[PDB]
Amino acid sequence: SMASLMEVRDMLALQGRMEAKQLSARLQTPQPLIDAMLERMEAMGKVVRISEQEWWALRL
Amino acid sequence: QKLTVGLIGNPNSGKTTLFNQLTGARQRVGNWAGVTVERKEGIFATTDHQVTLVDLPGTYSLTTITSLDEQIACHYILSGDADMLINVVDASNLERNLYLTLQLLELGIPCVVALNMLDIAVRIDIDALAARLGCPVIPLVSTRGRGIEALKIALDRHQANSDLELVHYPQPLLREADLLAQQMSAQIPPRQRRWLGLQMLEGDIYSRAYAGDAADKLDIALANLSDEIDDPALHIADARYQTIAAICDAVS
């Protein structure tokens, strides 16, 4: 019962945009592992980032 | 006694400045196999071999989705050029650095882990870490220039990586990836083909091509998953990040 790549997609599938700060705390999982997972899917094309601070959401 | 070592690792991890202290004075340069980027070869000597060290591009993985680097390294690894490799691994970002590490060890090619920059860190349980990967791990504090000598010595002895269940995948993926392997030519060592079958499922493009007459069966395999698996590209990279977390918990 520790987080999985598919659990992150499913998380962003509902709340859309989301700080990793939130993802780490809401998924009951260390931050730098969530940070590495996002960075993976993003290059895999599954997620993407937003700035102005970081925000992750779905798709190409 | 001549030896060739591939120096692969993440970007922003002193791969650059480790390559320096190994070679130091002797560093020639060239354009890479038919393109515009920099092949940085260097020579240094142990008290057994004259090592031809081959600096690779910085890369976070071997999954080639253009973003060459992955392919440039994925090529040189599969080319059978390197006698063995050195995976440079920063300890601060382990969860990041270790994706490349797990792929390199699944590919079986002899590897030695240079643990990086460890004044940037506190301290970790190294002996269990190396035995969880099945290879040797030399930790370093490079600004002293100490531990490099242990790494020079580690290239001399290491023969082959230990045979371990590095990543536990769901059997559905293995099943279909094994079949993509049998369609390939036996020119490739059977251990590698199992790997190339999984990279093809992940969405690798250089593997789609390297495997060749087999990529025609890729889409008909991916269809046989869609039934059971929602997205195979993820479960592959997931099961990797599972054992990534399993390791990083067991040492920190």
TrEMBL record, chain A:
Function comment: May function as a transcriptional regulator that controls feoABC expression.
Transcriptional regulator HTH-type FeoC domain boundaries: 4-52
NCBIfam families: PRK15431.1 (NF011960)
Source species of the chain: Klebsiella pneumoniae
Protein name as annotated: Probable [Fe-S]-dependent transcriptional repressor
Recorded name of the encoding gene: feoC
Gene Ontology MF, one: iron ion binding
Entry similarity comment: Belongs to the FeoC family.
InterPro entries xrefs: FeoC (IPR023732), Tscrpt_reg_HTH_FeoC (IPR015102), WH-like_DNA-bd_sf (IPR036388), WH_DNA-bd_sf (IPR036390)
Keywords (A to Z) from UniProt: DNA-binding, Iron, Iron-sulfur, Metal-binding, Repressor, Transcription, Transcription regulation
Positions of transmembrane segments: none
From TrEMBL, chain B:
Principal subcellular localisation of the protein: membrane
Domain FeoB-type G, first and last residues per copy: 2-161
Membrane topology recorded in Swiss-Prot or TrEMBL: Multi-pass membrane protein
Residues given in the record as GTP 1 binding sites: 9-16, 116-119, 141-143
Binding of GTP 2, residues: G34, V35, T36, V37, E38
Molecular-function GO terms, alphabetical: ferrous iron transmembrane transporter activity; GTP binding; metal ion binding
GO cellular component: a single term: plasma membrane
Binding of GTP 3, residues: D55, L56, P57, G58
Compartments reported by the entry: Cell inner membrane
Annotated positions binding Mg(2+): N20, T23, G24
Keyword Transmembrane: yes
Keyword vocabulary terms for this entry: Cell inner membrane, Cell membrane, GTP-binding, Ion transport, Iron, Iron transport, Magnesium, Membrane, Metal-binding, Nucleotide-binding, Transmembrane, Transmembrane helix, Transport
Physiological role: Probable transporter of a GTP-driven Fe(2+) uptake system.
Family: Belongs to the TRAFAC class TrmE-Era-EngA-EngB-Septin-like GTPase superfamily. FeoB GTPase (TC 9.A.8) family.
Protein name in UniProt: Ferrous iron transport protein B
